[PDB]
Structure formats: C-alpha cells, structure tokens
Amino acid sequence: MTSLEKARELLREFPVVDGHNDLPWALREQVRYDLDARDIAADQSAHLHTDLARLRSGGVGAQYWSVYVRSDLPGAVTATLEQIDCVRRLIDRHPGELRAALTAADMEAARAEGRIASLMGAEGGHSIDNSLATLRALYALGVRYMTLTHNDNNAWADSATDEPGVGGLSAFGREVVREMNREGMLVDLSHVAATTMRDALDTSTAPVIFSHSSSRAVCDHPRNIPDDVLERLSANGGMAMVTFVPKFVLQAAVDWTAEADDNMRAHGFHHLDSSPEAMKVHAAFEERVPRPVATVSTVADHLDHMREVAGVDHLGIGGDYDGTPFTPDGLGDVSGYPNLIAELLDRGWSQSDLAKLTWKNAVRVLDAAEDVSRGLRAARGPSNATIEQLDG
Numbered sequence: 510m511t512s513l514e515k516a517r518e519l520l521r522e523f524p525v526v527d528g529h530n531d532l533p534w535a536l537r538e539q540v541r542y543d544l545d546a547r548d549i550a551a552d553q554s555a556h557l558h559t560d561l562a563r564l565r566s567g568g569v570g571a572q573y574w575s576v577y578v579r580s581d582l583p584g585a586v587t588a589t590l591e592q593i594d595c596v597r598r599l600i601d602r603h604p605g606e607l608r609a610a611l612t613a614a615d616m617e618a619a620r621a622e623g624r625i626a627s628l629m630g631a632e633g634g635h636s637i638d639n640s641l642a643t644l645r646a647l648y649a650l651g652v653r654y655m656t657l658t659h660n661d662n663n664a665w666a667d668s669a670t671d672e673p674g675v676g677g678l679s680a681f682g683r684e685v686v687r688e689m690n691r692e693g694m695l696v697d698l699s700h701v702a703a704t705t706m707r708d709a710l711d712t713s714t715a716p717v718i719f720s721h722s723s724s725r726a727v728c729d730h731p732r733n734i735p736d737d738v739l740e741r742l743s744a745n746g747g748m749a750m751v752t753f754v755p756k757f758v759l760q761a762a763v764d765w766t767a768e769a770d771d772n773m774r775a776h777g778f779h780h781l782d783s784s785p786e787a788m789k790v791h792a793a794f795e796e797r798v799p800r801p802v803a804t805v806s807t808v809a810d811h812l813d814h815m816r817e818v819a820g821v822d823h824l825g826i827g828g829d830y831d832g833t834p835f836t837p838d839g840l841g842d843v844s845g846y847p848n849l850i851a852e853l854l855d856r857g858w859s860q861s862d863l864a865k866l867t868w869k870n871a872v873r874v875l876d877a878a879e880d881v882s883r884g885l886r887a888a889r890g891p892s893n894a895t896i897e898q899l900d901g
C-alpha cells in the first residue's frame with residue numbers, strides 16, 4: 510500500500526492522542542458557545558480546524574480540549590468554568606462520537622469503543638487565581654493538565670514570551686507543582702520560560718508534558734524546547750508533544766514574523782495592535798514580503814531531532830488546532846495527521862515507534878501521574894499554603 514494507506518491503518522489501531530486543541534475558545538469567540546451555530550456533527554471547515562468528521566478522518570482517538578482563558582482580563586476563573594462547561598456540553602451533545610475521559614483507563618475504554626476520549630487541559634496558571642483550593646476544584650471538574658503560564662508571566666511563574674519575572678518558579682510556583690503532583694494533574698511546560706522548565710523538572714516527582722511545543726535547536730523561538738531540557742525528559746519520564754504552528758517549526762516563518770513585528774513598531778504600533786490602521790500597515794508588509802509556508806516535512810524534521818535527543822518514548826503530538834491562525838501545508842486542519850505519519854514512515858520510523866508517538870506515550874504519562882498521586886495522597890494531606898506565606 511502507499512505510506513498514506515499504511516498510516517491510516519496504523520492509526521486505526523493506535524490513534525492520535527492530541528495534546529492541545531483550542532476549539533472551546535474558538536466557540537467562545539465566534540458564537541459565545543451557541544453550539545448549534547457551529548455544530549461539529551456538521552462540516553465546520555468554513556470556520557474551524559475541527560469537527561467530528563475531520564477528527565475521524567485524521568485518526569484522532571483522544572483529545573485534550575484546552576480550557577484556555579485570557580490572562581489580561583478580569584474574571585479568569587469564571588471564564589475557565591465556562592470553558593469547561595463548553596467541553597462538557599460538547600461531550601453531552603455527541604455521545605456517539607465522544608467519551609469523557611479522566612484517566613488512562615478511560616482513554617483505553619474509549620479506544621476499545623471507538624469513541625474519542627475527551628480530556629481537559631487548562632492553559633495558564635492564572636486560571637487558578639493564586640489559589641491551591643481552586644487548583645483542586647479544577648481537578649475535581651476534570652482538568653488533567655495545566656500549562657503553568659500562557660504568554661504572560663503570572664505571580665509565581667515566568668512565561669517564554671515575557672520578560673524575566675521570578676526567575677522560573679517562585680516558592681509558591683514550586684508549591685503549585687507539588688500540589689499538581691499530589692492531585693495527579695500533569696504539569697504542562699508549553700508557553701513557559703526555559704528557567705521555568707528547569708525549575709519544574711527539578712521540583713516535579715511526576716512525568717511532565719509539553720502539550721504543544723517543538724524543538725528550539727531546529728527553530729529558534731522561546732516557545733520551543735531547548736535540547737538540555739529535552740535531555741532531562743527521559744529521566745523525568747515525560748513527553749514533548751510537537752506542535753504545527755508555522756512560526757514555531759519553520760525558521761523562515763520566525764524570521765518573517767520578527768520582521769513583521771519590527772515593521773509594525775516602526776510605524777509606532779504595538780506588534781499585537783489589531784486596529785484597522787495597524788492592519789493596513791501589516792497588509793502592506795505582507796504584500797512586499799509573502800509569508801513563508803511550512804510543510805509536513807518541516808514538522809517531521811522536529812520529530813526526528815526530538816527523537817534523537819529525548820528518545821522515542823518521550824514524544825507525542827499537539828497540533829494547536831483552533832488555537833493558531835496558520836498551518837503547514839498538508840496539516841491544514843485536524844484531518845491531516847495521516848500525512849505526518851506517512852512522512853515518518855517514509856523516513857523509516859517503525860510501527861512501534863509510531864504507536865508510542867500517537868497513543869502509548871500519552872497513556873503511559875497519565876498513568877504515571879495517577880500512580881504518583883496515589884502515593885502522595887496516602888502520604889500527606891492537601892496544602893493550605895498561600896502565595897503571601899511563601900512568596901511574601
């Protein structure tokens with residue numbers, strides 16, 4: 510058969526566990542959670558990277574649904590609960606295709622049934638409002654990872670896309686990691702500074718994840734993972750779930766964005782200004798200089814390198830679909846994963862290497878977090894510490 514044909518067959522047995530999809534935020538922003546207006550049992554290709562038919566076509570067998578909220582607005586906890594409610598309602602509307610999953614055993618149950626295991630991951634520590642009880646409440650509601658920051662620092666952790674703050678994790682930051690370990694919530698080090706990565710790896714007694722990051726050696730962006738951190742993953746037992754964001758996998762796209770940003774500032778605009786005035790400026794840039802386009806091969810180059818540095822047992826996939834406006838050719842929406850698996854086959858990746866990449870590493874890591882949690886929950890009670898107490 511072709512490599513594509515083979516990829517599809519492999520994915521039927523060991524499907525993709527995708528680590529990060531922002532469909533809930535996209536539904537919030539497009540239709541304020543009116544789910545009939547973006548029904549995923551219908552074709553939503555005009556509006557979204559995701560719907561049920563494309564997930565099936567893509568070989569997705571489990572999804573960490575992001576319950577991301579902005580870190581620059583008040584009421585982040587309320588909005589996080591609204592994000593979680595969005596995911597719950599989606600599961601309840603599509604029981605034929607989706608199955609709530611809280612544990613590694615739930616994931617396997619879903620695979621056995623042919624339903625897509627639906628998990629939740631919070632995207633940024635601001636979602637807990639400096640409160641360990643709030644962290645515990647998010648776990649209770651089903652959240653099974655938390656990205657320690659989003660694009661901004663928070664009071665106790667530094668972000669990759671902000672200036673240095675506390676130097677990685679503060680004392681409270683370390684207490685958050687310890688409580689995540691006790692609860693069994695996976696520590697997600699996507700979006701955080703390299704300092705934060707190393708401090709988390711020092712502190713954590715459970716395997717950690719990167720739910721959507723690629724390789725800083727291949728594409729130099731602070732959103733990507735340095736080799737020294739990748740090297741620490743086998744000892745930690747965790748995994749890096751490669752992402753498709755073109756400016757994190759193609760060096761030319763990083764360079765292009767950096768030039769776009771400079772051009773915006775040269776016109777007196779913040780690089781994120783979205784005003785129509787700012788927009789005409791950017792339009793003129795893009796007309797002078799076309800945006801470079803990443804491909805499936807770009808992403809495979811990351812996986813080859815990450816495999817060499819971290820090891821095949823420490824890899825997964827996290828597309829960032831409905832979380833990023835641009836995508837690589839061949840990976841335009843959630844139906845694309847077989848194209849990536851076929852490229853890897855063409856590069857000589859074995860069937861067991863690919864079963865680990867797609868399914869088994871993710872299941873292992875969540876099981877390990879549950880195992881660590883069993884031991885810590887038996888060993889001590891939950892923390893009542895506050896940020897004032899530990900950080901001043």
Ligand SMILES: [Zn+2]
Pocket residue numbers: 632700721829832
């Ligand atoms: Zn993200």
Ligand SMILES: [Zn+2]
Pocket residue numbers: 529530531575577632832
């Ligand atoms: Zn996101």
